[PDB]
Amino acid sequence: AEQFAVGEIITDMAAAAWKVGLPIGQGGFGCIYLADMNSSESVGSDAPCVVKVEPSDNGPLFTELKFYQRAAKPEQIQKWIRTRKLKYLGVPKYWGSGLHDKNGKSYRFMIMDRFGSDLQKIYEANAKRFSRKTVLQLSLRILDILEYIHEHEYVHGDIKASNLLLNYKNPDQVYLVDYGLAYRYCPEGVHKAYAADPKRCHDGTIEFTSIDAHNGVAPSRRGDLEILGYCMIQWLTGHLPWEDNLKDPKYVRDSKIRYRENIASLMDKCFPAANAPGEIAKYMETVKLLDYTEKPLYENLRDILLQGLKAIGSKDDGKLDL
Ligand SMILES: NS(=O)(=O)c1ccc(N/C=C2\C(=O)Nc3ccc4ncsc4c32)cc1
Ligand SMILES: [Cl-]
């Protein structure tokens, strides 16, 4: 066994006891096991949690842990859900963390909410397409998530279908994961300058990353919204104009800078035969008007997408249609 014996009892820093289960998949998310509260019974497939574990010196886990401790406390999320009158919030809940010894070496572990399949698998099973309803419903919930993490001094910088996981018991609830390279843009309310972060480089995923990230500057709120824009196009059409040139970041940036200058040209490239949904253009055009340090007007962005739902004879009923 690499880290935890199936059935082992671990106690976190607040003295809460958990039992370890089987590893969850083999994905490039690190070492993850199913977990539950300590009891006589074994941890089965009905496990509500997971234990993510990495060595103490691992920088990304610590950064990820700090974000979870700061912005993902269960009560902190519920207070936001009640005040903003949301059905749920797609920020995974943090249940505790601790240190674990294995063969004289120290490891830090974190207990989190458990999820089922990622969006990418569902997307690939649907022949690399998502309906206008699915895309607009996903996007409204990601705007809820982004407003929350932005209001908590963080930017994600890597929004994509493989970082969007679905609730293990509820298929209409999507969660944004992976904060290993999340960035604290305005610590103690002081916005970061328009320059690189000296400690780490937040490149993201080449196809979806923002122009700011391509320019080698620290990610900001506008960049998270821009990444979401490229996701929406990729989900509706299965393509992006720069998809055959990923090994060249100069090309990807060049293409993005040109397309930001003329959004009608992007709509023309991505949508065949002048069939482009108006709310995508109105959204790209609103994000375009944002300054590096500017607070986005989220409700206005959600209203642009709500107009898109009315155009297809629908309402925000929270149905993902997966
Ligand atoms: N498409 S899939 O079927 O291969 C698949 C992918 C992924 C997972 N599960 C990953 C996680 C899970 O269940 N809980 C958390 C909490 C935090 C977190 N942070 C990065 S990954 C992650 C996870 C299950 C199935
Ligand atoms: Cl295709």
Side-chain angles (χ1 to χ4, degrees), residues 1 3-23 25 27-40 42-44 47-81 83-84 86 88-104 106-168 170-191 193-196 198 202 204-246 248-274 276-281 283-298 300-302 304-306 308-309 311-314 316-318 320:
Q3 185 72 31
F4 288 126
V6 168
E8 192 182 356
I9 307 143
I10 65 174
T11 299
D12 62 39
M13 88 199 307
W18 308 86
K19 190 180 258 193
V20 193
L22 302 148
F29 275 131
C31 271
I32 304 163
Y33 300 75
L34 300 161
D36 205 342
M37 288 178 88
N38 184 43
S39 67
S40 68
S42 241
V43 190
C49 291
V50 290
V51 57
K52 191 164 172 337
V53 57
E54 301 279 343
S56 284
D57 35 55
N58 189 231
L61 211 229
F62 176 75
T63 292
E64 186 161 56
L65 177 60
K66 275 334 281 159
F67 157 82
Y68 278 124
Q69 295 191 321
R70 280 170 188 161
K73 295 176 285 304
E75 82 275 11
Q76 182 171 27
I77 288 176
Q78 288 308 122
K79 195 184 170 205
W80 187 277
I81 291 169
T83 290
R84 266 77 185 170
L86 313 176
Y88 86 108
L89 188 72
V91 172
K93 265 143 165 156
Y94 165 74
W95 298 102
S97 75
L99 293 172
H100 185 249
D101 301 310
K102 187 84 179 277
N103 314 136
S106 220
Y107 299 80
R108 161 75 64 179
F109 74 83
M110 207 172 34
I111 315 292
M112 314 274 321
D113 262 352
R114 184 227 202 160
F115 307 110
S117 202
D118 70 356
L119 261 209
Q120 186 71 14
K121 249 111 244 245
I122 298 165
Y123 177 75
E124 273 152 0
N126 202 32
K128 287 177 129 262
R129 301 293 192 278
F130 275 151
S131 64
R132 205 183 159 181
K133 169 71 179 176
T134 301
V135 173
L136 295 166
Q137 291 292 155
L138 282 171
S139 304
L140 287 161
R141 308 286 87 78
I142 298 149
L143 289 166
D144 284 340
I145 293 160
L146 298 179
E147 182 174 20
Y148 182 80
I149 68 159
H150 294 173
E151 288 298 286
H152 288 83
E153 317 182 327
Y154 280 92
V155 297
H156 195 275
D158 204 11
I159 303 100
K160 56 176 179 184
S162 65
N163 281 339
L164 289 158
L165 270 37
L166 244 67
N167 192 15
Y168 86 102
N170 204 299
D172 293 297
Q173 293 184 354
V174 67
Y175 286 79
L176 182 60
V177 300
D178 205 335
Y179 298 90
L181 304 174
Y183 180 69
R184 203 164 162 227
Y185 79 97
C186 74
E188 320 296 339
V190 193
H191 204 302
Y194 181 81
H202 325 75
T205 298
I206 181 89
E207 48 267 54
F208 310 121
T209 205
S210 71
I211 290 148
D212 284 334
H214 285 299
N215 277 334
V217 306
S220 67
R221 295 175 282 194
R222 72 174 185 182
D224 271 7
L225 305 176
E226 178 191 340
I227 296 158
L228 173 59
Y230 303 140
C231 282
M232 294 190 301
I233 291 164
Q234 165 79 50
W235 296 341
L236 293 160
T237 68
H239 306 278
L240 277 169
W242 51 82
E243 68 177 1
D244 287 304
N245 302 76
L246 307 183
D248 194 357
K250 277 180 283 98
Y251 181 104
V252 180
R253 177 179 61 181
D254 184 71
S255 230
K256 288 169 178 166
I257 291 176
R258 292 182 183 265
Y259 280 127
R260 170 173 152 245
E261 269 299 293
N262 190 8
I263 283 154
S265 191
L266 181 62
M267 297 299 118
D268 281 31
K269 186 66 179 212
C270 300
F271 299 90
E279 74 286 357
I280 302 305
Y283 174 96
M284 298 301 247
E285 215 85 41
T286 296
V287 174
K288 182 177 172 170
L289 284 145
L290 283 173
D291 294 323
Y292 182 76
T293 63
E294 187 173 358
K295 188 186 165 296
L297 280 165
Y298 304 98
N300 267 38
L301 292 169
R302 278 188 302 266
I304 284 168
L305 297 193
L306 283 158
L309 287 171
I312 60 155
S314 208
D316 185 7
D317 46 33
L320 299 185

